[PDB]
Design an enzyme around this catalytic site. Structure first.
Site, PDB file in Angstrom:
ATOM      1  N   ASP A  12       0.912  -1.151   0.000  1.00 33.97           N
ATOM      2  CA  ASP A  12       0.000   0.000   0.000  1.00 33.97           C
ATOM      3  C   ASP A  12       0.947   1.195   0.000  1.00 33.97           C
ATOM      4  O   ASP A  12       1.659   1.370   0.986  1.00 33.97           O
ATOM      5  CB  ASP A  12      -0.897   0.015   1.218  1.00 33.97           C
ATOM      6  CG  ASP A  12      -1.787   1.253   1.323  1.00 33.97           C
ATOM      7  OD1 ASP A  12      -1.823   2.070   0.391  1.00 33.97           O
ATOM      8  OD2 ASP A  12      -2.444   1.370   2.327  1.00 33.97           O
ATOM      9  N   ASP A  34     -12.706   5.962   2.732  1.00 33.70           N
ATOM     10  CA  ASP A  34     -11.270   5.848   3.043  1.00 33.70           C
ATOM     11  C   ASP A  34     -10.831   7.208   3.554  1.00 33.70           C
ATOM     12  O   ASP A  34     -10.564   8.134   2.739  1.00 33.70           O
ATOM     13  CB  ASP A  34     -10.472   5.353   1.840  1.00 33.70           C
ATOM     14  CG  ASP A  34      -9.002   5.104   2.082  1.00 33.70           C
ATOM     15  OD1 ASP A  34      -8.436   5.679   3.065  1.00 33.70           O
ATOM     16  OD2 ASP A  34      -8.422   4.314   1.272  1.00 33.70           O
ATOM     17  N   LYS A  94       3.045  11.367  -3.634  1.00 35.82           N
ATOM     18  CA  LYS A  94       1.936  10.680  -4.331  1.00 35.82           C
ATOM     19  C   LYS A  94       1.025  11.736  -4.953  1.00 35.82           C
ATOM     20  O   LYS A  94       0.344  11.420  -5.915  1.00 35.82           O
ATOM     21  CB  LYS A  94       1.114   9.861  -3.354  1.00 35.82           C
ATOM     22  CG  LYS A  94       0.068   9.005  -4.024  1.00 35.82           C
ATOM     23  CD  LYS A  94      -0.459   7.976  -3.064  1.00 35.82           C
ATOM     24  CE  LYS A  94      -1.640   7.209  -3.627  1.00 35.82           C
ATOM     25  NZ  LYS A  94      -2.052   6.199  -2.634  1.00 35.82           N
ATOM     26  N   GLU A 106      -7.297   0.866  -4.627  1.00 35.34           N
ATOM     27  CA  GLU A 106      -7.455   0.839  -3.156  1.00 35.34           C
ATOM     28  C   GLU A 106      -8.825   0.280  -2.783  1.00 35.34           C
ATOM     29  O   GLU A 106      -8.897  -0.513  -1.842  1.00 35.34           O
ATOM     30  CB  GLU A 106      -7.072   2.200  -2.549  1.00 35.34           C
ATOM     31  CG  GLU A 106      -5.536   2.389  -2.610  1.00 35.34           C
ATOM     32  CD  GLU A 106      -4.918   3.786  -2.637  1.00 35.34           C
ATOM     33  OE1 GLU A 106      -5.584   4.652  -2.131  1.00 35.34           O
ATOM     34  OE2 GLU A 106      -3.722   3.970  -3.146  1.00 35.34           O
TER      35      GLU A 106
END
Ligand code: Q8L
Length: 377
Positions: free
Chosen positions: A7, A194, A68, A172
């Protein structure tokens, strides 16, 4: 060869292996299953993880994180323009793409986002290699469902730099659905909520006879647990000034020590109603000692908690879904342990309980490791 699952989160990474029919989420060398996605370039040394994150206070321009947010994007994208104004390390325009500029022994050095992500991947790889006692060449790596082909390829290129063949990129939401073992038979619509340290993502994931499809995604790129901590920080900085004529913002070390205790207090308040925040000599000759209640924690953050429902309404609208059309709600991210978050989601879904795990920060890596297992048969 083995295939590990990673992850690669905005604020953190997490690595799992599938071995002897079990997924093991691995500890880094500090004994933690979550590694901050930080890389520091200070004093001729390169650090990755918590040791790098600790350099951010005294060396903000040399401490790289949140890469990211940049990876596979263009320098002039509206999101990258915003991130350049927020991030304290230099971002430069290399032929239309954001690159990171730091100094190593005073020399200007520029990195592609995927070169910094590669350093995080290398560290996760080494955790797996030590644990498995053999070399690792292959991985499943997660991306957000909204990632485009350039963002996915840039993540794969990060893997290649780290000596990882990324055999599969999975989104994800799918990883979460694999971790929670959601039934693959028949058709079920799942809301994956999330809420991480820095980012909020919600997806409608449809599982149909083992085929996973994300029908809609929305979120808030600047909403997470770090923002809830900042609301608390802001409150107690004002109070300390009122009582002591000390503005703790004048001492960066004082702020670092406060943020660490505030993040612990926030976690405590997911379980208890009242907790003490204590720092001896937060500055010389002045102790910090305060009580925070769950009620004040919620009051300070209630607008941010309720903002999370705006992306939920958007995905239900994008997918032309009624709320009832959702069969199950799955929570991912440590911040979904906040009781008020769970309550707000339940009540939005005209009373339906959300499914949550016990280790919601590890669920995505867990699912990536399952996917690795699935690929090996
Ligand atoms: C570190 N990664 C993250 O995704 C964010 O998640 C937050 N984060 C982890 N854990 C939390 C918590 N834990 C209490 C707890 C413990 C056990 C059961 C139950 I119910 C509740 N409360 C509130 N935010 C929590 C962190 O503070 C970051 O911002």
């Amino acid at each position: 060869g083995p295939v590990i699952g990673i992850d690669l989160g905005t604020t953190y990474s997490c690595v799992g292996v599938f071995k002897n029919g079990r997924v093991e989420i691995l500890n880094n060398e500090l004994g933690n299953r979550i590694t901050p996605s930080y890389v520091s370039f200070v004093d001729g040394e390169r650090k990755v993880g918590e040791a790098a994150k600790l350099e951010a206070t005294l060396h903000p321009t040399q401490t790289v994180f949140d890469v990211k947010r940049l990876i596979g994007r263009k320098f002039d994208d509206q999101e990258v323009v915003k991130d350049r104004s927020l991030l304290p390390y230099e971002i430069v325009n290399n032929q239309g793409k954001p690159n990171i500029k730091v100094q190593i022994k005073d020399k200007d050095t520029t990195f592609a986002p995927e070169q910094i992500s590669a350093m995080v991947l290398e560290k996760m790889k080494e955790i797996a290699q030590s644990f498995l006692g053999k070399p690792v060449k292959n991985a499943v790596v997660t991306v957000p469902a909204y990632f485009n082909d350039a963002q996915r390829q840039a993540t794969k290129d990060a893997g290649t730099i780290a000596g990882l063949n990324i055999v599969r990129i999975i989104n994800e939401p799918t990883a979460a659905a694999l971790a929670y073992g959601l039934d693959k038979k028949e058709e079920t619509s799942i809301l994956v909520y999330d809420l991480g340290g820095g980012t909020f993502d919600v997806s409608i994931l449809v599982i149909d006879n083992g085929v996973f499809e994300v029908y809609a995604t929305a979120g808030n790129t600047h909403l997470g647990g770090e923002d809830f901590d900042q609301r608390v920080m802001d409150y107690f900085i004002k109070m300390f000034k009122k009582k002591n004529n000390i503005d703790l913002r004048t001492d960066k070390r004082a702020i670092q020590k406060l943020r660490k205790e505030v993040e612990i207090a926030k976690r405590n308040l997911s379980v208890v109603h009242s907790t003490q925040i204590e720092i001896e000599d937060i500055v010389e000759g002045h102790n910090f000692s305060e009580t925070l209640t769950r009620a004040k924690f919620e009051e300070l953050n209630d607008d941010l908690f309720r903002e999370t429902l705006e992306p939920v309404k958007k995905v239900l609208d994008d997918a032309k879904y009624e709320k009832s059309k959702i069969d199950e709600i799955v929570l991912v991210g440590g911040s979904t342990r906040i009781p008020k978050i769970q309550q707000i989601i339940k009540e939005f879904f005209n009373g339906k309980e959300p499914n949550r795990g016990i280790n919601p920060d590890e669920a995505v890596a867990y699912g990536a490791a399952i996917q690795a297992g699935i690929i090996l048969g």
